[PDB]
């Protein structure tokens, strides 16, 4: 199925974390198509910044045969 390769930077606001957090701060991850709307909202509500969005798998304007 079609997926997004997205880069996001989420900083900590609530607590100072003594452990290594660089992997969960600035990351580039692949997300499913149906999950991206929930994922983008999660980054936005936490107070993060989306760097780059690209459609890694699939092609724009797929009517049938996207799964």
């Amino acid at each position: 199925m079609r997926m997004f390769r997205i880069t996001a930077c989420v900083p900590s606001q609530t607590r100072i974390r003594t452990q290594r957090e660089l992997q969960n701060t600035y990351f580039t991850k692949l997300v499913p198509y149906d999950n991206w709307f929930r994922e983008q909202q999660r980054i936005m509500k936490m107070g993060g910044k989306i760097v780059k969005v690209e459609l890694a798998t699939g092609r724009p304007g797929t009517n049938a045969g996207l799964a």
């Binding site: 969005v53 690209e54 009517n63």
Partner: protein
């Protein structure tokens, strides 16, 4: 997110000064229009779906966008665009209540342009759709509060374009 109160606090916090006379009047102006911002959101919340209902019919429907070949032909794409415009109208109302457009830069415009470009979503059509929302939002609410909403809806348009 940053509100109008929070923005005045933050602006004075940058210089490191106390809330001066210029900062005090900016707060008082927001507190004066506070009742106006509450009633406007109450009208929006009453008929939130109704704005999205007619805005597609005014601009997008019976056009090449909804026609086979367009990016709003399928039910899935239609339900996506309906959702988008519903979220666009919701976050504009949030910006109207807060009195700041910093929420818009954080909660919508933060990585939507490159999302739309990657999916082949036409930028011209979506701007026209939010423009179709703008005047009908002003019609349902009023002239003073509709102009307030008209700024934030245009702020989404300027960010996407």
């Amino acid at each position: 997110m940053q509100d109008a109160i929070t923005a005045v606090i933050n602006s004075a916090d940058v210089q490191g000064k106390y809330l001066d006379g210029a900062a005090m009047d900016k707060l008082k102006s927001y507190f004066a229009s506070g009742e106006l911002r509450v009633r406007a959101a109450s009208v929006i919340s009453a008929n939130a779906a109704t704005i999205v209902k007619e805005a597609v019919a005014k601009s997008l429907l019976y056009s090449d966008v909804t026609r086979p070949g367009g990016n709003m032909y399928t039910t899935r794409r239609y339900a996506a665009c309906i959702r988008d415009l519903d979220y666009y109208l919701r976050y504009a109302t949030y910006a109207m209540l807060a009195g700041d457009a910093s929420i818009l830069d954080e909660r919508v415009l933060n990585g939507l342009k490159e999302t739309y470009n990657s999916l082949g979503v036409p930028i011209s059509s979506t701007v026209q759709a939010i423009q179709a929302i703008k005047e009908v939002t002003a019609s349902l609410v009023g002239a003073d509060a509709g102009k307030e909403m008209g700024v934030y809806l245009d702020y989404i348009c300027s960010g996407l374009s």
